[PDB]
Design an enzyme around this catalytic site. Sequence first.
Site, PDB file in Angstrom:
ATOM      1  N   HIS A  62       0.780  -1.241   0.000  1.00  0.00           N
ATOM      2  CA  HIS A  62       0.000   0.000   0.000  1.00  0.00           C
ATOM      3  C   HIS A  62       0.819   1.303   0.000  1.00  0.00           C
ATOM      4  O   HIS A  62       0.269   2.373  -0.283  1.00  0.00           O
ATOM      5  CB  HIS A  62      -1.066   0.078   1.080  1.00  0.00           C
ATOM      6  CG  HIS A  62      -0.625  -0.253   2.473  1.00  0.00           C
ATOM      7  ND1 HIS A  62      -0.947  -1.450   3.066  1.00  0.00           N
ATOM      8  CD2 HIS A  62      -0.003   0.477   3.420  1.00  0.00           C
ATOM      9  CE1 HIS A  62      -0.523  -1.452   4.314  1.00  0.00           C
ATOM     10  NE2 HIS A  62       0.054  -0.296   4.555  1.00  0.00           N
ATOM     11  N   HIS A  92       6.484   6.918   5.830  1.00  0.00           N
ATOM     12  CA  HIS A  92       5.955   6.647   4.549  1.00  0.00           C
ATOM     13  C   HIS A  92       5.207   7.808   3.911  1.00  0.00           C
ATOM     14  O   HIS A  92       5.087   8.849   4.500  1.00  0.00           O
ATOM     15  CB  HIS A  92       5.020   5.501   4.697  1.00  0.00           C
ATOM     16  CG  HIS A  92       3.816   5.831   5.480  1.00  0.00           C
ATOM     17  ND1 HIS A  92       3.576   5.247   6.671  1.00  0.00           N
ATOM     18  CD2 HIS A  92       2.837   6.751   5.311  1.00  0.00           C
ATOM     19  CE1 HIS A  92       2.393   5.633   7.125  1.00  0.00           C
ATOM     20  NE2 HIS A  92       1.918   6.532   6.310  1.00  0.00           N
ATOM     21  N   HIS A  94       2.011   9.138   0.888  1.00  0.00           N
ATOM     22  CA  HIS A  94       0.789   8.975   0.126  1.00  0.00           C
ATOM     23  C   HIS A  94       0.963   9.931  -1.070  1.00  0.00           C
ATOM     24  O   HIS A  94       1.452  11.067  -0.907  1.00  0.00           O
ATOM     25  CB  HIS A  94      -0.423   9.371   0.940  1.00  0.00           C
ATOM     26  CG  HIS A  94      -0.566   8.608   2.225  1.00  0.00           C
ATOM     27  ND1 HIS A  94      -1.305   7.439   2.279  1.00  0.00           N
ATOM     28  CD2 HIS A  94       0.091   8.690   3.410  1.00  0.00           C
ATOM     29  CE1 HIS A  94      -1.192   6.919   3.489  1.00  0.00           C
ATOM     30  NE2 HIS A  94      -0.366   7.655   4.200  1.00  0.00           N
ATOM     31  N   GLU A 104      -3.437  13.484   1.831  1.00  0.00           N
ATOM     32  CA  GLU A 104      -4.591  13.048   2.641  1.00  0.00           C
ATOM     33  C   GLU A 104      -5.279  14.207   3.302  1.00  0.00           C
ATOM     34  O   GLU A 104      -6.452  14.430   3.022  1.00  0.00           O
ATOM     35  CB  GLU A 104      -4.137  12.010   3.666  1.00  0.00           C
ATOM     36  CG  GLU A 104      -3.512  10.786   2.962  1.00  0.00           C
ATOM     37  CD  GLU A 104      -3.723   9.517   3.789  1.00  0.00           C
ATOM     38  OE1 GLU A 104      -3.226   9.457   4.926  1.00  0.00           O
ATOM     39  OE2 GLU A 104      -4.348   8.591   3.220  1.00  0.00           O
ATOM     40  N   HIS A 117       4.290  10.929   6.266  1.00  0.00           N
ATOM     41  CA  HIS A 117       3.894  10.583   7.621  1.00  0.00           C
ATOM     42  C   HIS A 117       5.048   9.964   8.338  1.00  0.00           C
ATOM     43  O   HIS A 117       5.568   8.914   7.870  1.00  0.00           O
ATOM     44  CB  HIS A 117       2.673   9.593   7.641  1.00  0.00           C
ATOM     45  CG  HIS A 117       1.422  10.214   7.095  1.00  0.00           C
ATOM     46  ND1 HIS A 117       0.420   9.506   6.457  1.00  0.00           N
ATOM     47  CD2 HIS A 117       0.973  11.488   7.191  1.00  0.00           C
ATOM     48  CE1 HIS A 117      -0.533  10.341   6.088  1.00  0.00           C
ATOM     49  NE2 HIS A 117      -0.213  11.555   6.492  1.00  0.00           N
ATOM     50  N   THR A 196      -4.850   6.339   8.947  1.00  0.00           N
ATOM     51  CA  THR A 196      -5.639   6.577   7.725  1.00  0.00           C
ATOM     52  C   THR A 196      -5.720   5.342   6.837  1.00  0.00           C
ATOM     53  O   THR A 196      -6.249   5.414   5.737  1.00  0.00           O
ATOM     54  CB  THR A 196      -5.085   7.762   6.905  1.00  0.00           C
ATOM     55  OG1 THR A 196      -3.748   7.472   6.472  1.00  0.00           O
ATOM     56  CG2 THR A 196      -5.074   9.077   7.738  1.00  0.00           C
TER      57      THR A 196
END
Length: 258
Positions: A62, A92, A94, A104, A117, A196
Amino acid sequence: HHWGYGKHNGPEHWHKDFPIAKGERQSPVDIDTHTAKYDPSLKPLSVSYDQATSLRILNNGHAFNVEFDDSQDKAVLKGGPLDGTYRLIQFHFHWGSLDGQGSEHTVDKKKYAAELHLVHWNTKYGDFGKAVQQPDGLAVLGIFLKVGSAKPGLQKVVDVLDSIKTKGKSADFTNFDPRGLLPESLDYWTYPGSLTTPPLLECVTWIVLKEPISVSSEQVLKFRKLNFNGEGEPEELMVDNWRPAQPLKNRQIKASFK
Ligand SMILES: [Zn+2]
């Protein structure tokens, strides 16, 4: 039929397996800069990352995580809205399929190209797995990325991504210094929220920095070459691995700055 970010398993489906998806303290949210309350009682954040020990980078299907040694107080976050010492365990990102989406958190509805994050857990609970069961168990530092100039301190991350292209791959990743990812200013918004991704537990004190870092088109292009799938299952590019903004409900976002 595991959760993910597609049409058939994506965030709007997650509640069927994780009912807390519709909870009262879900993340991320939109940060309304005019409704956020300056709280001059908030202390400055204290980031002590000079002794950080990175170990490994991995593609978990992911995102990719860079993991740190959290067996002692070597990279810690203190101060701000936090009581106690929170140890860094992983970071990590997103990101999006295009430069206009990816983050996010939003700021007055503006999406950034990506969101970093840095995940920390409250040492009073003894380990990460115990910390996620508590309302003050984790502290996540959120940093926006916009596309512009290159960030030199990220290039070491970008260069190894070829070696962890598919789900389940890992690589040794020592002597990476996370201080190269921080913006200049440490001003922040903070609110109580959640992981999240599933299990979406409501254990997170969010600290989202006001000042974005800049990365190059070429740097973020390299994130978009990664794969959600394992080797060699059919290729599905790891893009748009972000959850949309959730209802703020009964929470106030506080700012460390006016
Ligand atoms: Zn995240």
